[PDB]
Amino acid sequence: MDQECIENYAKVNGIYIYYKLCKAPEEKAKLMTMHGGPGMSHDYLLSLRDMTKEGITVLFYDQFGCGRSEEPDQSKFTIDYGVEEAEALRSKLFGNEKVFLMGSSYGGALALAYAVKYQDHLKGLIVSGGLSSVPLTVKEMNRLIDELPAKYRDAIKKYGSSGSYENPEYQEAVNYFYHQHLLRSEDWPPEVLKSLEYAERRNVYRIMNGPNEFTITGTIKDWDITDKISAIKIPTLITVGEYDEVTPNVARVIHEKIAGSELHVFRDCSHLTMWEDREGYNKLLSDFILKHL
């Protein structure tokens, strides 16, 4: 069964980053995880921790300016910097071993940007609810907004149009959206709540993402590397939910570009598929890693 994890606060390429590694028994493969946001934390991905009894070691770590890690210079708020951070961590920790990469949401996109440069260091890639193009995901989310009942749809196009995010009606619509496309549940896990809490307390989510999940005005609103991800040749497991805020259509684009890549859609699921179907999610990412051992 579980055997706790080794927590540390090491110095990466310039800044102090927090990480939590859980390895063995009978380790077969090592796996690094990248939370979403931007500006969240490993916390909400702690369900993937169950894969250790399946011989999978997991590396949970808060990215720059996230969770328990120090915030770098405002200019370092880019995805290209996260990639340099990831590689530095994998190396000054695992040496020159080939590790499996797992990215969730923004982490998925980051995970992709990683493979585009350091795929040779990876043995496999897992992109869950991720994206390769922000403008695309934005276009997809807008549809979801229009598909929401007028009671909330209008509130999102009104108060979200006058900068009135502190409005209760609007905040009411944001919630309905989250309980529909972010996480389908009434008893949200603490891990998620902590990562969400970390998003409102730091500055990354603010400066890179925006007010909320469906109102991106940060510094990635134009990010798009679709014409780059085609160069990835390693085994890729792309998962996405049915009601996923980052539609399976956006997951489809990634599927095309990556040859031989798998694509799995979780019915009755949304964005955080980690808690909606923990056993099935982990099982899928587990067998994926074990076959491409």
Ligand X SMILES: *[C@](O)(CCl)[C@@H](N)Cc1ccccc1
Footprint on this chain of ligand X (rule: CB under 6 A): 36-37, 104-106, 134, 137, 209, 213, 216, 246
- Rounded alpha-carbon distances, angstroms, from residue 272 to 129, 150, 248, 257, 268: 8, 25, 13, 24, 12
CB of 206 vs ligand X, minimal distance in Å? 12
Residue type, 262: E
DSSP 3-state of 19: strand
Our CB check for ligand X shows the closer of 57 and 209 to be: 209
Q: Would you call 35 a catalytic residue per the annotation?
A: no
Dihedral sign, Cα of residue 262, residue 266, residue 210, residue 83: negative
Catalytic: 179? no
**Shortest distance, position 213 Cβ to ligand X, whole Å:** 5
Catalytic residue among 244, 261, 270, 286: 244
Residue 184, both tokens: 């389908």
Question: From the CB of 218, what's the least distance to ligand X, in Å?
Answer: 8
Choice between 121 and 181, CB closer to ligand X = 181
Q: Are 254 and 229 in contact (CB under 8 A)?
A: yes
Residue 222 CB, shortest distance to ligand X, in Å, is: 11
Residue with tokens 């996109």: 109
Q: How far is the CB of 291 from ligand X (least distance, A)?
A: 27
Q: Which residues contact 57 (CB under 8 A, 6 or more apart)?
A: 21, 22, 23, 24, 27, 29, 30, 31
Burial 150-188 (b: 16+ CB within 10 A, else e): eebbebbeebbeeeeeebeebeebbebbbebbbbbeeeb
Q: Which is nearer to ligand X, 132 or 137 (CB)?
A: 137
Q: Confirm if 250 and 133 have CB atoms less than 8 A apart.
A: yes
264 catalytic? Reply is no
Helices in the chain by DSSP H: which ranges? 79-94, 106-118, 134-147, 150-158, 168-177, 190-201, 204, 248-257, 273-276, 278-291
**Minimum distance of ligand X from residue 252's CB (angstroms):** 16
| Residues annotated as part of the active site | 105, 244, 271
